[PDB]
Amino acid sequence: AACERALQYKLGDKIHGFTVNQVTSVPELFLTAVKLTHDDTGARYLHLAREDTNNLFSVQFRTTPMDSTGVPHILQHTVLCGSQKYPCRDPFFKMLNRSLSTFMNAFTASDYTLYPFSTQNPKDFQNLLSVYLDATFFPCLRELDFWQEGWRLEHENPSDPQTPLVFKGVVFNEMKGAFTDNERIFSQHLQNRLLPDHTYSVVSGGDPLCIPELTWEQLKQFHATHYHPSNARFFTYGNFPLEQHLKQIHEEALSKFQKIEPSTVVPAQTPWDKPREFQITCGPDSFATDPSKQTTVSVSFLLPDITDTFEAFTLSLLSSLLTSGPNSPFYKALIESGLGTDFSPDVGYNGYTREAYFSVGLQGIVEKDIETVRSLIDRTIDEVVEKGFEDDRIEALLHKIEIQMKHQSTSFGLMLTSYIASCWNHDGDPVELLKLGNQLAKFRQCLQENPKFLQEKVKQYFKNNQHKLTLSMRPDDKYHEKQAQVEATKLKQKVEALSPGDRQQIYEKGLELRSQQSKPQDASCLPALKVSDIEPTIPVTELDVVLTAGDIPVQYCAQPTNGMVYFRAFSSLNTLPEELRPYVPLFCSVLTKLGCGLLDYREQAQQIELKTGGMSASPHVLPDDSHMDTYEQGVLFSSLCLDRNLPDMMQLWSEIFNNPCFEEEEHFKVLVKMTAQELANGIPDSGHLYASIRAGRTLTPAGDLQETFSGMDQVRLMKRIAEMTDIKPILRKLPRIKKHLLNGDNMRCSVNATPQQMPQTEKAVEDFLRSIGRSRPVRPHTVEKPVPVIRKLVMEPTFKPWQMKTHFLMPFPVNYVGECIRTVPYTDPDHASLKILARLMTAKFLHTEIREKGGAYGGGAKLSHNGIFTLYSYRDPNTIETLQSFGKAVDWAKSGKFTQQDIDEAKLSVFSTVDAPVAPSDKGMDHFLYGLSDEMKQAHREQLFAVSHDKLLAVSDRYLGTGKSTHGLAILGPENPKIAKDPSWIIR
Numbered sequence: 001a002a003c004e005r006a007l008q009y010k011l012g013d014k015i016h017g018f019t020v021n022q023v024t025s026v027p028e029l030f031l032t033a034v035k036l037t038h039d040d041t042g043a044r045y046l047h048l049a050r051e052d053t054n055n056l057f058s059v060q061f062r063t064t065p066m067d068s069t070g071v072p073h074i075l076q077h078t079v080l081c082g083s084q085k086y087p088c089r090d091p092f093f094k095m096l097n098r099s100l101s102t103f104m105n106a107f108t109a110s111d112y113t114l115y116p117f118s119t120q121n122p123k124d125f126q127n128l129l130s131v132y133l134d135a136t137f138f139p140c141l142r143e144l145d146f147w148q149e150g151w152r153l154e155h156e157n158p159s160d161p162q163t164p165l166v167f168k169g170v171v172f173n174e175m176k177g178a179f180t181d182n183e184r185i186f187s188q189h190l191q192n193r194l195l196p197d198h199t200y201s202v203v204s205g206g207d208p209l210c211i212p213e214l215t216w217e218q219l220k221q222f223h224a225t226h227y228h229p230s231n232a233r234f235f236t237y238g239n240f241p242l243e244q245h246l247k248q249i250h251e252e253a254l255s256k257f258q259k260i261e262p263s264t265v266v267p268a269q270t271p272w273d274k275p276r277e278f279q280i281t282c283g284p285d286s287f288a289t290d291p292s293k294q295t296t297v298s299v300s301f302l303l304p305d306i307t308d309t310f311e312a313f314t315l316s317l318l319s320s321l322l323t324s325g326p327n328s329p330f331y332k333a334l335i336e337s338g339l340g341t342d343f344s345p346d347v348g349y350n351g352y353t354r355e356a357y358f359s360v361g362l363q364g365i366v367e368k369d370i371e372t373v374r375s376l377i378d379r380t381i382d383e384v385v386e387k388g389f390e391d392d393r394i395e396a397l398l399h400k401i402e403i404q405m406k407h408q409s410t411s412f413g414l415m416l417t418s419y420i421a422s423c424w425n426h427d428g429d430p431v432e433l434l435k436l437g438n439q440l441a442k443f444r445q446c447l448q449e450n451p452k453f454l455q456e457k458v459k460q461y462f463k464n465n466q467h468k469l470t471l472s473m474r475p476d477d478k479y480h481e482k483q484a485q486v487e488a489t490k491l492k493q494k495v496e497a498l499s500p501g502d503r504q505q506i507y508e509k510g511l512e513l514r515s516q517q518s519k520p521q522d523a524s525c526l527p528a529l530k531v532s533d534i535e536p537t538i539p540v541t542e543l544d545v546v547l548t549a550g551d552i553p554v555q556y557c558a559q560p561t562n563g564m565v566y567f568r569a570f571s572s573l574n575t576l577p578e579e580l581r582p583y584v585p586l587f588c589s590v591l592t593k594l595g596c597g598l599l600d601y602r603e604q605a606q607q608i609e610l611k612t613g614g615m616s617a618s619p620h621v622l623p624d625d626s627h628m629d630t631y632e633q634g635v636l637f638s639s640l641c642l643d644r645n646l647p648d649m650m651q652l653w654s655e656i657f658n659n660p661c662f663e664e665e666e667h668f669k670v671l672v673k674m675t676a677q678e679l680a681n682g683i684p685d686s687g688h689l690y691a692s693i694r695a696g697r698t699l700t701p702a703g704d705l706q707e708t709f710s711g712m713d714q715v716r717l718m719k720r721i722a723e724m725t726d727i728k729p730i731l732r733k734l735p736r737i738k739k740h741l742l743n744g745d746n747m748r749c750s751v752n753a754t755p756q757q758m759p760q761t762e763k764a765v766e767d768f769l770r771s772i773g774r775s776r777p778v779r780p781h782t783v784e785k786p787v788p789v790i791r792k793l794v795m796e797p798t799f800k801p802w803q804m805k806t807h808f809l810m811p812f813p814v815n816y817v818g819e820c821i822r823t824v825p826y827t828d829p830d831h832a833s834l835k836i837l838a839r840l841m842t843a844k845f846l847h848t849e850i851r852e853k854g855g856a857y858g859g860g861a862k863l864s865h866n867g868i869f870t871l872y873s874y875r876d877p878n879t880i881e882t883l884q885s886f887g888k889a890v891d892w893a894k895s896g897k898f899t900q901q902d903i904d905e906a907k908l909s910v911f912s913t914v915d916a917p918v919a920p921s922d923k924g925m926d927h928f929l930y931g932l933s934d935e936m937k938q939a940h941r942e943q944l945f946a947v948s949h950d951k952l953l954a955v956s957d958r959y960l961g962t963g964k965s966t967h968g969l970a971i972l973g974p975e976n977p978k979i980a981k982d983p984s985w986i987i988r
């Protein structure tokens, strides 16, 4: 094993310019931590040796912006645009298609920037390490790359100098879109006001109104000050040998540098002598909600340095006990009181900054209740200090942590490096964050030695703490219009200030940029894997289907789950009256939360938290593999637990199926409003998903149901329900739904657990199935399709697809665009071609047109299992032009002007996605949900391998050409005059 070999490292070992400083076994995480420092530069290194073939690298820099230009964010984009060893244009995006990576990306936190990738191929790992090391340490930082990624002045027509100058840039629009999320606005201001004395007071990602203040020289200087290895933390994880990583890192990068003392320290925030208050504004919601019904207020407290790890562990658990779930004191005082709709953003513990902070409050407050909310926060703090916490809640909490520690995920390295970053950033010891057994033991010991331990902590940090911030936010109906006018003004000033020489240089550089964006260039300097590096076959999944409780099929899959059990049940929707369909998602979200039998909603929540890692239900439409107009509909019941709590888990499922408390009217109203609030808040962030779902709604029977379940129709339905004065007519629908769903008449189940736990599990499941009820479909055409377990699917053989174009009028500064095209299902031989084509179009055409030229944050094409080919954009400054580029993309595809190497790279990209690691808990789910056998997946795999140039041009013409297939279109974004005057567009 890797972690055992790492145990052979000794203190003082010299390896490729590094010295081993510490070797620590962490058996609760099955890993050995190795701490090293690079001798000449002093750069810190952490290697986590573990038997995991999905290896990860990251490099981290302490980046401390002193303004809101977004320079660290823009620099992060720009270093990926070309480097000394890989000077060609855009090494990073190109490597995405020359790799079998499981993850490739970068991001910018408030005061650090992190560059991680992961892969299961050791040669791929070396390739990516070289590209990453060169980008970060020796970037070209070309002026025009900065103009593309950051901001620039550009003529509306770059080759016409008589057209007006406008602002453009990828990050420019990226941040406009980020702050389309009003929770993100609140969150940004909270941090800026609470920590006003240094870097944390600015908008690290870039305030859109300040971004055009960034100059090329400021960008280069910021790299010089922060991208030195003495200011870096290097991280690797997995079973690939450490020696090779260290060799590259020293020889490629670190050997070129000497040690410095980086001018990058973040000083401590000096604590306030008295509390502060501030008021801010945000955008209106999408539903023209009255601003006096939409107030957010929160109260935040400054906490100690996160580098004091045990105190940080204490405060984190404390914050959870205060705010998590319907038994927490703040939930009870604030949420169940009906004072708001949900917690305010960043509720709980925030430890990404040098000093952590706790925050609590509400959104959805009527302005008149604001002073009551503030009062209740204070009163709740006083009560907790006096009474402390329930013992069984503390046990539930430690159980919750145990489940996190034991659960096996497929991206453990990515999770770990993100997790330790802020602590490491301020010279903390990341290894102490891995020693969870120690932290827990000391926490338990503190509780035992001092019965008022947590009460004392609450008094010290929440009652006596003068560094307290009250922040309130109210929507402004012209928030973004006001932003745009300020920008229009700023733009005008910039432009009128230009000399004739400036205007000429802006014109020439713009044409030079467009040229660089257009002219095909050689990428041979870049490393690459080959298609022959892709595995020919996949490891078979061993499962065992057992008919149980009579005729109910249960799928058993033995896996290394580390003492965890994962249970799923799938119950058909085929007998439910179709009028109840829209209410199934609501039914699903409250089913495990209203109480069951003798446990009221509070008792049930406590049991669920003490005995499980979660219990949920969700509605699903599962498209058939061979027929576009056939699907399966049902509800998925899902849960997980430790081995020893399996019986308790199934006891909960039994009571939930048999006696859910649908008379719980008051907690029901609370959940409805929480859900509606959260759905509305999530629209911008998933803007393109909402567009795609609307656009596909008229293309297949399933698409129509999917919009009902999770489209804008569903968000709107929840919003209406949440505003009703009498929710009784809705609540009375829940029993009608239970009648058709909560029984074993049309059910199948799955179990994932260790082989030695399987026997106990079969018993517990069979008992559950015998405890729920037993003894014709609403749709006239249903088909039985056996699995290579017989699924009963709906088919609508008279379904005819039709075209629709919908514009959702949204108070957004950017757009979200979707165009869906009906093409064949998964088992159709043309499907593999279309899948390759999607990635090809994305890489070769759409990314450049929509993002690089347009300045949209994202633009591409994808193909779903259902056979819907989707073209989309995300945070897009343009709507009509994007729709035009969708069309030109299909013309390009039809033209066949892509090479064999382009096709090979599209294959690499696609296989890097479909061969991504599956967790032990999820093995066999392709079979369970979609009825996809290994023989089907392998046939699909061979079709993907066989995809050729002539096949690609053929399917481009056959399905994507004009008039060949049915299209659907949708946009979320502000008013567009051209669209408003086109009668083929429905405005919503």
Ligand SMILES: Cc1cc(C(=O)N2CCN(C(c3ccccc3)c3ccccc3)CC2)ccc1[N+](=O)[O-]
Residues within 6 Å of the ligand: 349, 350, 351, 352, 401, 404, 405, 415, 418, 419, 420, 422, 436
């Ligand atoms: C700094 C930070 C990091 C994380 C984080 O990455 N995770 C993921 C890992 N997870 C670890 C953990 C869970 C419970 C108790 C202690 C630590 C974790 C989970 C599983 C394995 C190893 C660590 C904590 C949350 C979340 C929030 C914050 N923060 O707000 O300050």
Ligand SMILES: Cc1cc(C(=O)N2CCN(C(c3ccccc3)c3ccccc3)CC2)ccc1[N+](=O)[O-]
Residues within 6 Å of the ligand: 306, 309, 310, 312, 313, 316, 317, 320, 351, 352, 356, 397, 400, 401, 402, 404, 419, 420, 422, 423, 432, 433, 434, 439
């Ligand atoms: C209670 C809880 C918390 C967290 C969590 O977010 N963190 C993030 C912060 N993290 C702190 C920490 C972990 C290990 C050792 C010491 C502290 C922490 C990590 C980095 C900076 C500041 C605090 C604790 C867990 C995740 C899950 C659970 N849970 O299981 O209910």
Ligand SMILES: [Zn+2]
Residues within 6 Å of the ligand: 073, 077, 171, 174
């Ligand atoms: Zn970005």
